[PDB]
Design a protein around this ligand. Sequence first.
Ligand SMILES: [Ca+2]
Length: 192
Amino acid sequence: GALSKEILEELQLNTKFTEEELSSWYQSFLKECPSGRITRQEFQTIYSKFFPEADPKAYAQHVFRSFDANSDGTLDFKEYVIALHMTSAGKTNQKLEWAFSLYDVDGNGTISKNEVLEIVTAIFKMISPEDTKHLPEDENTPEKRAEKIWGFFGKKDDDKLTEKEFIEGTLANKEILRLIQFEPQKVKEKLK
Ligand SMILES: [Ca+2]
């Protein structure tokens, strides 16, 4: 009710649901998760189920962590709905602040070279083996993709990437957007 309103406030035009629809989904959510909280393991199970061609555990863990840099505890319904929107609905360029939170693995406010590699690796595991053969040579392994991203940002190995820079680059350089892309269907689509 007031819960759905908060979801709409945060998603705005990213939403695929009205307030009434969210409330119905919530009532169903509570039948299966009566506390209204979902653990990381439970969240991972959703992705394992719906991406049978992939190895989604790492990806789902990073998505769960995106909100607070914490693997422990739970998501509430709001965070769970937002997470599913981030992975699955809408346009990547409407998700850039969230994408920064995804890439900032340790939550310290900047992205390191290793963090890019970690997230790129997790996303890469969402790609079916069939589909990976059709990636460009210079973008067909996690190391190649992560190093390309780092190079597009003009970064030395020990440099830190700020949110300001990340947003600028992902807006302006469409090659950066393509390489940081985290939605499994989109990576697959622009692949084919
Ligand atoms: Ca960081």
